[PDB]
A paper describes a structure:
In prokaryotes, the two proteins [name] and [name] play critical roles in the processing of the Holliday junction by promoting the ATP-dependent unidirectional strand-exchange reaction known as active branch migration. We show that [name] motors rotate together with the DNA substrate, which, together with a progressing nucleotide cycle, forms the mechanistic basis for DNA recombination by continuous branch migration.
At the opposing lower side of the hexamer, cluster [D] contains either ADP (s1), fragmented and interrupted densities (s2 to s4) or ATPγS (s5). The connecting density is best described as ordered water molecules, which are required to facilitate the nucleophilic attack on the ATP γ-phosphate. Analysing the effect of the RuvAD3 recruitment (s1→s2) to subunit E revealed that the binding event exerts a wedge-like effect on the [name] hexamer, which drives apart the large domains of subunits E and D. The motion of subunit E suggests that RuvAD3 binding is achieved by an induced-fit mechanism. The repositioning of subunit E causes a concomitant displacement of the large [name] domain of subunit D, which then promotes the opening of its nucleotide-binding pocket and thereby enables the escape of the ADP molecule.
Author numbering:
A (entry chain G): 156 to 203
B (entry chain H): 158 to 207
C (entry chain D): 19 to 331
D (entry chain C): 19 to 136, 141 to 331
E (entry chain E), F (entry chain B), G (entry chain F), H (entry chain A): 19 to 330
Write the structure that this text describes.
Amino acid sequence: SEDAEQEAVAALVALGYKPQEASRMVSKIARPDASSETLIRDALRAAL
Amino acid sequence: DAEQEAVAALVALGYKPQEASRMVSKIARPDASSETLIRDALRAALHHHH
Amino acid sequence: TLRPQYFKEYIGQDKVKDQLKIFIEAAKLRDEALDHTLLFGPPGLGKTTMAFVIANEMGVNLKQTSGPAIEKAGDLVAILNDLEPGDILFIDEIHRMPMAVEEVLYSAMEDYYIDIMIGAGETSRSVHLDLPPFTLVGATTRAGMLSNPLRARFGINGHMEYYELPDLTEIVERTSEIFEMTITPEAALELARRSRGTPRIANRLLKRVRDYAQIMGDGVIDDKIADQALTMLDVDHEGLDYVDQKILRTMIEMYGGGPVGLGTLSVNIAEERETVEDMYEPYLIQKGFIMRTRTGRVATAKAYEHMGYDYTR
Amino acid sequence: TLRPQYFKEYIGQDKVKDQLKIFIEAAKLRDEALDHTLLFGPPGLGKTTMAFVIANEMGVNLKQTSGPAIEKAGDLVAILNDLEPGDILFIDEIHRMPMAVEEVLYSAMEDYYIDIMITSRSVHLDLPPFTLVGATTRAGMLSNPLRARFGINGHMEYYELPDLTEIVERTSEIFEMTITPEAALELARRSRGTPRIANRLLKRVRDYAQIMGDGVIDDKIADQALTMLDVDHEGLDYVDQKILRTMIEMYGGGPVGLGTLSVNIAEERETVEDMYEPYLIQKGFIMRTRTGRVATAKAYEHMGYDYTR
Amino acid sequence: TLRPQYFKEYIGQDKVKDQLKIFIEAAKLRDEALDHTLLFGPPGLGKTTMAFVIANEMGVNLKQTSGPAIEKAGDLVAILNDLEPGDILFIDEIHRMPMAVEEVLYSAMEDYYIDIMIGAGETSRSVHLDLPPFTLVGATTRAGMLSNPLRARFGINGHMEYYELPDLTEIVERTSEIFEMTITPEAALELARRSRGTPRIANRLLKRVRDYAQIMGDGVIDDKIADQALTMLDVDHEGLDYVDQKILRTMIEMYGGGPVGLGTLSVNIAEERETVEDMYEPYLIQKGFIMRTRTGRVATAKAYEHMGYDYT
Amino acid sequence: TLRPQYFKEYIGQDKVKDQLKIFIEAAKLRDEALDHTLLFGPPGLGKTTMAFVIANEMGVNLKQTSGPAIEKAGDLVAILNDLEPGDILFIDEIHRMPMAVEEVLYSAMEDYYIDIMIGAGETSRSVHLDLPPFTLVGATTRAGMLSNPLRARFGINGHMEYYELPDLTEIVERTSEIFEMTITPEAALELARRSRGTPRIANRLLKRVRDYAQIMGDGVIDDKIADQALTMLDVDHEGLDYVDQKILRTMIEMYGGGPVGLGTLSVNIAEERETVEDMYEPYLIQKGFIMRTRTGRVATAKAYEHMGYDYT
Amino acid sequence: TLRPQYFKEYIGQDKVKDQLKIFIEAAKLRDEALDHTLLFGPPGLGKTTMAFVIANEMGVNLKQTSGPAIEKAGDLVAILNDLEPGDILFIDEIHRMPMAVEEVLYSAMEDYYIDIMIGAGETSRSVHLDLPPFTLVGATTRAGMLSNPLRARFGINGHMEYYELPDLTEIVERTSEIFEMTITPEAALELARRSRGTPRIANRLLKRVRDYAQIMGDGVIDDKIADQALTMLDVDHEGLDYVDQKILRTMIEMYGGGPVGLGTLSVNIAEERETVEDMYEPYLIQKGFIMRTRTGRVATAKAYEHMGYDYT
Amino acid sequence: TLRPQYFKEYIGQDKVKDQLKIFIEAAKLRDEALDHTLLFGPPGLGKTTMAFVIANEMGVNLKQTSGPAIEKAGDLVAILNDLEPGDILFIDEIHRMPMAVEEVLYSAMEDYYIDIMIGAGETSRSVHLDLPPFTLVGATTRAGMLSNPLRARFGINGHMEYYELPDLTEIVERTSEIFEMTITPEAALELARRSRGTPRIANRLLKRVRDYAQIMGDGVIDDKIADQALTMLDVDHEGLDYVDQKILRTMIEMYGGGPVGLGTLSVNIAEERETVEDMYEPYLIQKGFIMRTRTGRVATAKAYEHMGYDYT
DNA sequence: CTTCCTCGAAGGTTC
DNA sequence: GAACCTTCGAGGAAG
Ligand SMILES: Nc1ncnc2c1ncn2[C@@H]1O[C@H](COP(=O)(O)OP(=O)(O)O)[C@@H](O)[C@H]1O
Ligand SMILES: [Mg+2]
Ligand SMILES: [Mg+2]
Ligand SMILES: [Mg+2]
């Protein structure tokens, strides 16, 4: 899952979020097994 | 000696000291010249796309 | 009605209203979203209200935001995920969006997907996010500063116009039903003619006439009271304030129509340069009473026949 | 005190004073807040004074701040959070607020709610009914969207000799000076139509009456006191009288340019145009022309010369 | 995509199209890169589309960027290093990039190498870096806005121009096929006459006439229907838009043809002066509807008769 | 010392000096602060000197600063809040203060309070600061550069005029006792009449003649020494410099008195158009040697009888 | 390479070369730098090339920049600190360098010292620098647009004229010899006559005709091929450019030959005033197509007999 | 060196030297600093040179800066904080200082103190800085730009005149000795008559003739080598350039001596309107070749004999 | 975003 | 009607 976490967190940073806040945002998500697409979708949806 | 030159060249091109350090520090080759280092630090940092 | 739900309930704007009716009906005849629409016009005419009516006619939900409230790409991308299939996104003041976000909107508009490039060199990759079809509705008061690539994405253009006496009168009549006061049709016309064609200005005069009609009268706004109310206030039968009349009289009586400079005119009426040039002068130009020349302002023949002075070439 | 407290004490401004009485009485009858008011016009006419009268006539507690002091959105939000129902917020020199703040204020004036991102965070607040009062000398400097939200406009005008004469009599009793009816009119004529200038002359005359007199103002003391200050019976100062004299005796009435006239009186070009000429043009002693400026027949009669076209 | 991919498919621009063929094939005979090319002309004529055709005819991988996308020398230097021999680099709005970047570009185009000077005072050095052979293709809206010393570096100048009715009628019919639109050869000419020479406009009008034909008609675009639809879109028979008609009507009715100053005109019609002089005046001047004088704008006789007003 | 300290030692300015005597004495009988005074007029006439005299006569301490030093509201809010009851604040060159700062003085001068935002973030609040009674004094050469709401608040206005031959003669004798030199009364008048009515110019001529009298003479100034020194400086009996004479001569010997334009005359003397109009022309007109007309400059009869020609 | 290396390779400009030979040779007996030299004249005549020849004759390094590229006074100081003794600094378009920068050259050229502020805040201090001996070579189009203080410091001035047919003909023959090509003497003369008297244009055209003759022809250039190839381009039968045609074709139709001010003409043809007056007007005047008048420019009879109009 | 260092070596300017000698000698006897002095006059006459001579005669260190180097009040305060008792501060091109900084000198030049703001911002107060005795030396090419309150504070004014042939001849001889070139007195007078009375121009011509006299002369500037060299530079025997000669010829050949207007003549010579009036006309009028009149300008008899035509 | 200053037009006199 | 001189007004660019 570290591959998706690093990829999804990195893509979230590419959207302009700070590395610290971006790491927390995805770290705040529960499901680890879901792919990067789900993490970014759930992360931004929850952060709305 | 090429480290100070490569870093100074990248600074002259407008890279900040933080990134210029990381860029040159990420590459390592004792036989590389300051020319081939500059041609590597940038080629290693540009996002190639298709 | 003041709060409308369909194009049947929207007062005025008959030209733009007639076009959109044909486009919406055609889009409904296919499983397609309406093309991206751009609305142009001066401020205060109703661009926000029209965007809502477009959504109800489409039978779709409406999302609202603004250019200034968007500061990073993540802000816009997060909003797009909230759009259901066919949803409408309304962006006000779209001309102020920073280029860092503008470059991201092109693919969403053109292809309905976003690419998020990540990595560098040998690690270069990109993630792909599918988006449901949506209609972007933009509104801007300034078009000359939109980039050509953004302009080419919008396919439907609409131009707003100032309201006309036969319909601005209905806005007054309707507003008089929100308050609980009777107003005669002849009195309503005399207020509409002085409202400069803007609904916001017509509401202000109605409130002021209301206050007079219930302290100096029987609580009814008839033609007899409207004349007295409009006599206390300076507003003439053309909408000109007291200071507006003083400017025209000064130019005609003391300078023979000009040319006269901004500084020389200001010291005669006792006002600042910026006050005459930005408060009073803009309406006098639109009405056609003055012109600006390399040598100063000059009064036109239309002004002479309105103030009631004899004119000579 | 020098500042009147109620409309029953505010002399003049019959146009603005009459209009506000109708709007204040109607608002009370409906128990609603007064609409937003903008006061503008020349200096010294009564803009700041009227702002306090409106609060007393409404019977409300006045909150007070200024434009220059508010420098960031965080400042305005803090002030707005302190308002209670019916409170009045008065902002003097409103033309100085930053553009980043005007956009926040014209939203609050429309919908009575704020939602702004002030380490950044969003804050949302709801506001009770309140009235904003603004005063400015440079109304044309306010953004066009903000001017559209004000529902009442008050433009101030100069005063007449009967209004200023009564003001001088009122002020004289606060200083506990004795003044005659015909001596007051001699100060009103010279006050250029402005209350602040009429109050200034009374203070300068009182100083002379106490040292060079018995501490009482009369038709004889005023003659001497006004000769020392060198103020003509039309309010012309020493430099004002010198300008008209030079024009009539060296250029035959003009036309003459601003530069030539300035060098001949030993004054700076910007002092004549910005400090002395504005009153001479409004009274009709001088006219501006495409080729220069000329003295009118009114100046010849006042200075005592035989007019020749 | 709608755009063509080879010269044998690109409609119009016969002059530009014929010149490039000779230079492209001649360069192949010599087995060397093509000279730097500058494309200029009004917006929407096909400048970007041509850039892709050149790369396909040469048989090279196209690389793209734009003037605003380059912010520091490292950006340009990086892109130039990622090139392969013979690559074609296309740069939109080559006149918009910052002046500090141009200093580096001048060396590359002329010498094919860059030499980064480093050190100060007692220290002073420079690193000499070779670049592969390449070709720069630039596109701008005005030729005179570009920095004069840069213009001398471009060997080939290609001036684009408005299409004629035969070309526009073919483009309109071609597009109608993609959309599966039934259009008669006469109606296609009606839209071409009113598209005022720009393919981008002709395509946009067609998309709007389709909707009208599907409701106010039987899905068949006849000349009789196309003419009614264009009056609904408020497009004149000469192609003057709503804004263009508003300008001429105001000059004739409120100022008797002028002269009138730009400030007065731009305040009467609620439009920004920056827009009037940039987006609308150029077509009215080229088509001879308006003339500019030191006293202001003036309406010509042609305009007086077109709008339908008796000339003085 | 070189600056007077009491109205006894302040020669001239009868109008301004007489008014300030009454206002100061009346303020003392009521035991209250003096009203706000604005001093303005030409350079070198005694503005800064009078500011220190008023402070001594009132018997209070003087706080001094200048317009160019005050750059932001934080500075003014720091100078204020350090005042004690009855202090005098003197700001020189008050016309330089930014207008964004002048608007802070409106409340302080009229009502002795200011509105201060205190704290930061959620702690930001507005509170009144209350000032003790005080007198603001300002000196400026460009009174017309101040804002109308500010000039309206100054309660006393003092305009400085030029001196005359009796007053300047006494000033020269007084200064001749600060230095240790004997000066004959006849010589003192000869220097006064050449000092254009300005005390600063009279002191400068005395210093220059002192040097000559102690190097080329016996250390005493007499009609013989004074006339020799004034010949080296080349200043005539009317105060005309070397170039002033060259201008008048050229007008009378080449143009017969004029009319002549400024440009045509500048080239004949090898001066430049801005030096002649700003340095030399002002005193020639103020003293009646030249007259300005729509057609050009003209020399008056008074100039002919000075250069010795015939007024034909 | 194409660019000449020594005076024996530089063709034409005999008047300038003859003078520079003497001064350069004299500057070699004594061990000193060459005086600051100013070159001026129309664009494209070969003045940047001359700078390289002087540097190679002196045996020193040449650094290059341009006026518009220098943004602030700190930029020029950084350059001057990086010059070796005897180096040559070439500054193009020196008349457009900002005033804040030009002010620094006055001291540097006359005395080889510069005064500048170093450090910040409490560390700020003034240092006096020493500049090693160096030569400044300036280039400008407008000999009279430089300020009076700058023009007085240049010790040598050179005016560069248009080339004659014998000179241009040989330049075409030389350029067609660097490239592998064969051109007949009659073709060289025709191509030179068509080249606006400017070397840059002659090279650009020859480089293009090389392609046509290699594809559409026999691989050799002859008058028959030159006349055809020059007709596929826009070059007129007497060298007028397509922009030149718009100018003449506008004045004769929109203004009846004139007179017309070049300001209003430029905005009606959609060309920048500066480009048309610097590049195109000088040639049209020196060849009799346009004549000057106080009211503006007027089209001569020579234009009517060229464009095919009636000289009514 | 080229610049003289003592009043014995400084040729000419006797009126300025005579005054400065008396004032410097008197200042030393009292053991006090010299009064502030202002040097002004046309370019190249020796102002900057005199400023250094004064420092050598007083026998003190000279501090140096320039008008365009000072950007903000912080710089000026820092410079003044480094002063030592009796130091001389030279500010060249003083007219370039910004007004807000020039007004800081008003106190420093006569009260020797400055008002500064200090502290972190929580606590901040005004304080008087106190300066040691110093002498400010200013030099400017145009004094009309200095504000009236500043010019009044300078105690000694020096106005530079042009040089005469006797004095200018000695400058050429002195310079020939430094170059170690022999020059005949007959030739030294031939260069002086062409130098327009300016030392800078006489040095420039002598350097150019020195080169020619040794590359193809025989190492001696004889009466004939000078004529051959000066003919190559195209300098007439009155110092007229080709442009100056063209003007006089045109007026005589095409207008019979005039009167002719400025706009009419400019067109007949293809010269820019302001160039003729600012660059060329001033010297022609001063020497008497041209005369301005109410109906135009006329060429005098002097201009006839210089060209060889028959005056009538 | 603001103060300054310079480019430009036109009224009036004289031969 | 060509040439000079003065005065006003709106830009624009360097802070
Ligand atoms: N006399 C000459 N002989 C050979 N080639 C020349 C000559 N003069 C100019 N050229 C060529 O023409 C071009 C001139 O460009 P350049 O010297 O930069 O002109 P500019 O300096 O006016 O821009 C160069 O390509 C140069 O090689
Ligand atoms: Mg107030
Ligand atoms: Mg002072
Ligand atoms: Mg110097």
